[PDB]
Amino acid sequence: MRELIRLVSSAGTGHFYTTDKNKRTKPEKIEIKKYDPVVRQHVIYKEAKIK
Amino acid sequence: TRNGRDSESKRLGVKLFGGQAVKAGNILVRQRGTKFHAGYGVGLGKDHTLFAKVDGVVKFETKGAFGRKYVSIVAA
Amino acid sequence: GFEGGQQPLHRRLPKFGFVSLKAMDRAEVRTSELAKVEGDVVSLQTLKDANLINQHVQRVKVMLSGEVGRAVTLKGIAATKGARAAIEAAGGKFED
Amino acid sequence: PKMKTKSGAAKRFKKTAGGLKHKHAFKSHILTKMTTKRKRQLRGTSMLNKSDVARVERSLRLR
RNA sequence: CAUGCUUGAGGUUCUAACUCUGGUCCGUAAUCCGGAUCGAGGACAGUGUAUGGUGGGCAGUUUGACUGGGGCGGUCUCCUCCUAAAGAGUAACGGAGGAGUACGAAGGUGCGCUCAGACCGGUCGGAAAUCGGUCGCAGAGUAUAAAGGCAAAAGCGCGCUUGACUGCGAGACAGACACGUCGAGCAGGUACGAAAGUAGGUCUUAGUGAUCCGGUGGUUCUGUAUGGAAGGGCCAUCGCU
RNA sequence: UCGCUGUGAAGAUGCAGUGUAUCCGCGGCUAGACGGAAAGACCCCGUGAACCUUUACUGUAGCUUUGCACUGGACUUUGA
RNA sequence: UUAAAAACACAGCACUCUGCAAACACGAAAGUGGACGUAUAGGGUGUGACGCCUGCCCGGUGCCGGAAGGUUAAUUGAUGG
RNA sequence: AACCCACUCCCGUUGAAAAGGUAGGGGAUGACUUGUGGAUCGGAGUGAAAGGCUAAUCAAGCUCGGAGAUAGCUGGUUCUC
RNA sequence: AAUGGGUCAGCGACUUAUAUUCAGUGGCAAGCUUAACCGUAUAGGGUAGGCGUAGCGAAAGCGAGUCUUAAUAGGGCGUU
Numbered sequence: 060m061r062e063l064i065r066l067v068s069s070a071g072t073g074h075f076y077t078t079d080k081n082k083r084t085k086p087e088k089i090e091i092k093k094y095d096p097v098v099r100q101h102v103i104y105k106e107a108k109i110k
Numbered sequence: 111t112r113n114g115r116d117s118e119s120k121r122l123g124v125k126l127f128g129g130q131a132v133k134a135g136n137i138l139v140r141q142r143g144t145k146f147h148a149g150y151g152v153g154l155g156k157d158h159t160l161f162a163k164v165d166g167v168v169k170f171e172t173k174g175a176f177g178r179k180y181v182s183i184v185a186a
Numbered sequence: 187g188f189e190g191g192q193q194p195l196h197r198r199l200p201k202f203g204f205v206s207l208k209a210m211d212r213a214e215v216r217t218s219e220l221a222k223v224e225g226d227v228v229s230l231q232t233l234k235d236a237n238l239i240n241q242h243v244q245r246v247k248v249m250l251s252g253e254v255g256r257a258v259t260l261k262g263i264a265a266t267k268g269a270r271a272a273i274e275a276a277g278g279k280f281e282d
Numbered sequence: 283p284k285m286k287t288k289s290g291a292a293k294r295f296k297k298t299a300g301g302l303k304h305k306h307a308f309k310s311h312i313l314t315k316m317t318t319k320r321k322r323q324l325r326g327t328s329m330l331n332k333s334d335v336a337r338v339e340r341s342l343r344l345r
Numbered sequence: 346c347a348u349g350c351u352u353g354a355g356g357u358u359c360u361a362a363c364u365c366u367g368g369u370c371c372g373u374a375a376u377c378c379g380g381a382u383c384g385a386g387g388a389c390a391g392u393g394u395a396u397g398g399u400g401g402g403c404a405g406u407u408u409g410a411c412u413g414g415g416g417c418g419g420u421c422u423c424c425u426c427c428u429a430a431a432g433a434g435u436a437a438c439g440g441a442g443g444a445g446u447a448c449g450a451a452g453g454u455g456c457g458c459u460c461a462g463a464c465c466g467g468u469c470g471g472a473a474a475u476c477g478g479u480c481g482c483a484g485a486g487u488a489u490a491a492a493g494g495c496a497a498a499a500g501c502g503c504g505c506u507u508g509a510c511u512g513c514g515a516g517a518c519a520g521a522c523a524c525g526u527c528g529a530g531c532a533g534g535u536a537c538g539a540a541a542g543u544a545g546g547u548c549u550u551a552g553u554g555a556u557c558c559g560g561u562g563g564u565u566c567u568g569u570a571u572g573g574a575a576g577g578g579c580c581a582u583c584g585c586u
Numbered sequence: 587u588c589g590c591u592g593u594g595a596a597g598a599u600g601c602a603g604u605g606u607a608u609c610c611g612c613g614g615c616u617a618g619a620c621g622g623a624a625a626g627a628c629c630c631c632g633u634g635a636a637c638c639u640u641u642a643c644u645g646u647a648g649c650u651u652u653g654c655a656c657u658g659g660a661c662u663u664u665g666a
Numbered sequence: 667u668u669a670a671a672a673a674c675a676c677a678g679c680a681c682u683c684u685g686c687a688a689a690c691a692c693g694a695a696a697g698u699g700g701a702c703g704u705a706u707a708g709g710g711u712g713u714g715a716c717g718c719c720u721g722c723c724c725g726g727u728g729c730c731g732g733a734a735g736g737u738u739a740a741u742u743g744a745u746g747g
Numbered sequence: 748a749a750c751c752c753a754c755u756c757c758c759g760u761u762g763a764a765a766a767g768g769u770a771g772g773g774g775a776u777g778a779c780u781u782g783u784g785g786a787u788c789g790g791a792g793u794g795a796a797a798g799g800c801u802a803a804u805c806a807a808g809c810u811c812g813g814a815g816a817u818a819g820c821u822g823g824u825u826c827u828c
Numbered sequence: 829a830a831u832g833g834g835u836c837a838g839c840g841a842c843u844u845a846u847a848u849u850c851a852g853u854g855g856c857a858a859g860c861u862u863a864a865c866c867g868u869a870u871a872g873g874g875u876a877g878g879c880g881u882a883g884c885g886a887a888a889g890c891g892a893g894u895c896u897u898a899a900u901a902g903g904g905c906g907u908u
């Protein structure tokens with residue numbers, strides 16, 4: 060089953076997104092570009108642990 | 111008996127009929143699929159909902175090829 | 187609060203906020219109440235000589251309501267910007 | 283003697299000049315599967331419904 | 346490593362604590378009880394307190410509803426069709442089927458293209474593979490049931506990509522409440538395209554669970570003499586067949 | 587304070603139609619007055635009660651393990 | 667005070683516990699019964715004169731014995747934050 | 748036979764009697780019957796065991812208190828327009 | 829032919845205290861009113877306290893505005 064993850068911004072701010080993924084089929088970490096409200100720019104987000 | 115199931119009713123159908131006055135943002139028809147297609151001044155939602163982008167009068171005309179049915183808004 | 191066994195409102199919704207104990211020593215005074223002290227000096231102890239504030243109040247602020255009656259001087263009492271002009275306009279000196 | 287207000291009602295409804303405020307439900311957990319629009323519109327505080335004022339006031343001993 | 350300094354653990358021994366429902370003296374004229382003295386045991390036993398195990402010996406309680414009586418059997422939340430009487434809604438232990446997910450591309454955008462099937466010819470396959478031609482117009486397809494849709498294809502392929510964005514939100518639909526559904530537009534930053542433009546997930550409708558409590562990341566709030574902290578609040582998120 | 591056939595909260599002395607019948611006792615018999623007696627014991631219901639059972643839940647008397655106190659001396663083995 | 671029986675008791679049989687301040691029972695305890703008894707004795711359990719007999723199973727749950735190993739309480743408090 | 752008991756039939760059932768009577772019936776030197784005095788009791792006693800008995804009361808006596816327990820259940824609720 | 833009542837006479841069931849909301853009727857009025865208590869004792873005093881004259885915010889706080897927000901944009905609540 061799909062397991063929850065967290066996407067945390069490359070900026071020093073603690074802002075994060077949340078989603079889920081297929082850990083068995085896609086093992087590589089998700090490296091997405093999203094909008095950071097705190098700094099107000101589009102930056103890079105990286106996977107972490109939802110727990 | 112192995113049958114006792116059903117689902118709640120969704121209240122679909124025509125909300126504003128022909129000749130009626132619409133305000134922008136009003137919901138016109140609730141659908142599954144596009145039984146009515148959006149005409150002038152009418153937009154389509156992401157669940158095939160017809161709403162109003164302008165003010166005026168409901169028209170309800172069928173026209174064009176393919177024999178479709180169109181909901182539009184005309185000046186009152 | 188009973189509803190027949192259905193979950194009632196006072197247990198269906200979340201609790202929110204906290205109670206500020208800082209505001210329990212606070213009082214607010216209209217500008218229309220300022221022309222009721224004995225003479226020309228609006229202080230904390232003079233507002234208690236009338237019944238404008240309780241005996242447990244330590245901080246007082248003046249808001250704009252009504253009209254100022256005379257020319258009073260405020261001793262260590264805060265005021266808003268609208269009340270600052272209203273008090274000052276009618277010769278009311280403001281100090282401390 | 284004196285009427286005792288319900289403790290749990292006073293923590294969830296706050297009295298204002300515009301009625302009684304309260305927060306929204308369905309915002310405690312299970313929040314990844316929710317839409318951002320749905321969570322954004324459950325964020326503020328709102329007024330009690332006209333059909334709940336009587337039964338809530340009677341819990342707060344206001345009527 | 347003899348050696349000195351303390352502590353952990355076991356074994357034996359001694360008497361002096363404690364024990365005797367053992368003998369003889371006295372109180373006393375007394376199978377109680379004390380005191381004295383002999384004998385035995387001996388730092389064990391036993392009691393207080395803290396703690397693990399066992400414990401129907403004893404106790405306070407729980408053990409759902411629907412239902413052509415109750416039990417047994419079956420069901421209980423959500424989606425699609427009929428019943429349902431051409432607006433909505435509408436019951437039965439009425440007639441039929443599905444859900445408790447999937448997808449970082451199966452999402453966005455620009456460009457490009459049309460299926461199933463039949464017949465004819467063609468090297469081994471041969472009724473049916475791959476190939477060429479004619480006919481066909483949707484009898485195909487749609488991640489997943491059924492209904493309603495589908496040429497600007499919502500179907501199929503490729504390049505680039507992250508709008509599966511943040512704050513809102515005129516106005517509506519539904520509705521006992523709590524929840525639910527659609528959304529033009531405005532402001533920030535973006536992605537495709539020469540541009541007009543399109544994009545706030547997927548053709549639409551199932552894929553779900555209130556509060557309390559507790560954990561994790563931030564915070565212009567509070568912080569019981571004061572300065573901090575603990576704790577609390579707010580915002581984001583996690584844990585319920 | 588009659589019978590019958592119908593009607594009717596569906597088995598009538600009392601309602602409809604009709605037939606019978608002067609007024610009142612006494613000795614007898616029990617077919618009806620859904621006759622008297624006991625707020626049905628059977629059945630179901632009540633977020634009722636008791637008492638009984640057990641590997642239902644949560645406790646508990648008793649029994650049992652160890653730490654500390656009452657509680658000491660010497661030798662010996664052994665560890666830091 | 668609707669059941670006198672095929673029910674209960676019984677002599678006989680077996681298992682088991684108990685070394686005496688006995689096991690066991692009543693008592694917050696002192697104490698008392700067992701017993702002024704001492705394993706040919708005392709308590710519990712089942713079967714039920716007498717005759718012939720009483721077969722196989724120790725996997726489950728109890729009880730008895732074992733102590734190597736695995737887990738395991740109060741207590742103590744290395745180390746880190 | 749006395750004495751103790753209660754197997755059968757009938758009567759009685761508003762009884763002579765809130766468990767009897769008339770006819771028959773069982774034991775009758777014993778694990779017998781009986782008088783007087785004494786001991787054990789309410790989650791307790793006693794029981795050759797029937798859930799039996801503990802003052803005509805027993806799957807937990809009687810009495811006084813908590814107490815006007817609680818009763819989503821029956822019944823009743825009084826003059827006029 | 830479901831309950832209750834043989835009949836009479838007498839008794840027999842929406843009360844009281846304290847907190848509070850709405851309406852009617854009064855006193856004062858941007859103010860109204862006192863509680864314990866004192867008392868020449870239903871007077872008079874006693875205005876500690878309660879409600880009103882200002883809201884918004886979870887709060888610090890700001891105030892005819894405030895909160896959300898990067899936003900004097902929108903929107904919620906409030907104001908003659």
Ligand SMILES: *C(=O)[C@H](CCSC)NC=O
Binds near residue numbers: 628
């Ligand atoms: C059933 O037959 C019922 C109760 C009998 S006793 C179980 N009849 C009563 O008359």
Ligand SMILES: [Mg+2]
Binds near residue numbers: 113439
């Ligand atoms: Mg059915």
Ligand SMILES: [Mg+2]
Binds near residue numbers: 114
């Ligand atoms: Mg069905």
Ligand SMILES: [Mg+2]
Binds near residue numbers: 116117
């Ligand atoms: Mg239906």
Ligand SMILES: [Mg+2]
Binds near residue numbers: 154
């Ligand atoms: Mg859209």
Ligand SMILES: [Mg+2]
Binds near residue numbers: 191
């Ligand atoms: Mg429930």
Ligand SMILES: [Mg+2]
Binds near residue numbers: 237240241
């Ligand atoms: Mg005052």
Ligand SMILES: [Mg+2]
Binds near residue numbers: 288289292
């Ligand atoms: Mg409270």
Ligand SMILES: [Mg+2]
Binds near residue numbers: 308309310311312313
């Ligand atoms: Mg939620």
Ligand SMILES: [Mg+2]
Binds near residue numbers: 309
């Ligand atoms: Mg939150």
Ligand SMILES: [Mg+2]
């Ligand atoms: Mg003894």
Ligand SMILES: [Mg+2]
Binds near residue numbers: 378
């Ligand atoms: Mg002695």
Ligand SMILES: [Mg+2]
């Ligand atoms: Mg002695």
Ligand SMILES: [Mg+2]
């Ligand atoms: Mg000695």
Ligand SMILES: [Mg+2]
Binds near residue numbers: 389390
């Ligand atoms: Mg010892």
Ligand SMILES: [Mg+2]
């Ligand atoms: Mg010990």
